[PDB]
Every structure is written in C-alpha cells, then in structure tokens.
Ligand binder design. Sequence first.
Ligand code: NI
Length: 341
Amino acid sequence: TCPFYKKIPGTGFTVDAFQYGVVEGCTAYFLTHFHSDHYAGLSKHFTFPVYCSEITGNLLKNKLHVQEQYIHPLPLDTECIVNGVKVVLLDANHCPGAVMILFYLPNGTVILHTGDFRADPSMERSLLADQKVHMLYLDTTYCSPEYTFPSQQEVIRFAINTAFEAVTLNPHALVVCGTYSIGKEKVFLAIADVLGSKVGMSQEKYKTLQCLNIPEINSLITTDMCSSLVHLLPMMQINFKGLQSHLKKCGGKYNQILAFRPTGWTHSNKFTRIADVIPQTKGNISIYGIPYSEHSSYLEMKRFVQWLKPQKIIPTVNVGTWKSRSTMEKYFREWKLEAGY
Ligand code: NI
C-alpha cells in the first residue's frame, strides 16, 4: 500500500508510486526521473496515464517498453492542465530528464515536489520566483551538516587533469569509468573529450544514452571497444579483480588502467580535500573514488529552503527511522527560526 508522502491531497495524483498495484483514487501517475527505486513496478503491461519529461518518456518506451498510448511527456517551464489541475515541470539538476513538479490545487494551495534534486541558486530565478509555496515534499538524502562535498565543476576539473596527465605520461594506459544508472555522464564525457576519444560501452548502455537528448552524442560514444581508450563498465566490475580481467580482454593494446568510481558522499570527505585525493593501487591498476553528487549538500539544501520559506515540509528520503525523522525535524526548525518565516 502506497505511503502518504507519495500522494498529492486534493487531487487524483501520485508521485513515484508504481510498486503498490492499482492505487485507489489515482487517475494520473507522475514519474520524476528514471532511477529504479522511483520507477519500481512499471512495464509493458501498465495501463494508466504516466506523466513525465520527454527524456523520461523515451526511456519508458525503449527500455521498459511501456506502450506509447500511456506515456504523456510535458515540456519544461510551461503551465499545463492535467485532469483539471494546473502543473509545471522544472529541471531538478539531478540526472537527465529529472524534474520537480509544481501543483496548483483547486483550493488555492501550492505544492512543490522536488523529486530527487541538487539545489542551486539558479532555481531562485525559475518560475518559483513568482509565488508562495505552502507544502514542500523534499529530497532529504543529505540532510545533516556532516554531508559536505565539492562542486561538480571542481570534481570534473580533477578528473580531466588526472586522466590527461596519466595518459600523456603513458600512451598505453586505458581509462575505465564505472556506472549503474543514468546520471553523472559528464565524468566519462569530459575525460574522453580531453583525450580525443569516443567512449566505448556495451550495446545496452549505448541504447540508454541514445534516449537522453544529449547534443552531438553520435560524435561522443560507440560500441566499438577497439576504437576507444575510455571504456564504461558496470560499477560492480570497478575493483582489482574485475579490472585485471578486463585488461586481459584488450589484446595487449594496454599495460596500465586508471579507473574512476563516481560515488556520492563518502566519510573520507570528512578529512580529505578534492585536490589531495589519492587512489588505491595494486600493480599496474589504480582506482579513484570521486565525490560527484547529483543530490544537494546540506548547505545547498538549507539555502534553497530558507529562500523558498515553505509553511510545511514533508521529507521523501530517510523516512524509515525515528532517529532520522527527529534529526530532520530539528534542522527544519533551526532553519525557520534563523530566517524568521
Ligand atoms: Ni535519483
């Protein structure tokens, strides 16, 4: 049964609620983004209207085979009427196709559902500038002050400079990057651009990327592994055993691997600056963990909420323990007392 924080009151709508069977009273199912914990339950046998971005709808049709007659893509930044209710989709600064949803309820209440997001000051100049929000359904993934990490731009600078130095020192080094979902494509795209290479990958991953409306993508990626010196592999293979095994398959073209694991936050962020990050090494294999986040830091989250000044917050992440719920409620009250709303 569908939990309360996935239902939008005063509407027939749910958000990211496909794993509960037929939800009583639901006339339209919204999907914020194509990540498995959020789409859990969708397939070619789904027969209710799904509302989403264009990129999410391309993934639903090609990867999950949802029939076309049930996919309702909406443009961004544009007032739309759905089942008698005004809605707007906004860019979430998460993975490709990820949105936040503004709902203008028939009684005058305004709700913002962030989906998953990485808050940014640019959101202060979206269509949010113009009006009051009563209720905020908030991605609270990193809602505690210990969660610090650098800007995506600083992380990419470190990656590009590391890869270029290594391959210039040894033209026979291969670069490998891990992945297990959409998101974080700038990591492997930026490294391949500095090296003058396309990115090589499986047919299954190439198919996924072809759904994402990335400009000039045909110029940037390939299934011909032999033509490429930046390879994508499943995240599970980014370990000394899996990398050794991969290097064997490359027919003596290469004699070294440099590999990247984009994670979110890790407790080494408590101590080490991005500039000082070092790899784990075994023989001719080095592995870097890089803190590339597609979720708000604590400070970015706090800035957004103190600007928006919502009357009520409903967290959508870390909701399963009393300790997590009490910690988040304490920070929401701090924020409200500090800013005066
Ligand atoms: Ni996500």
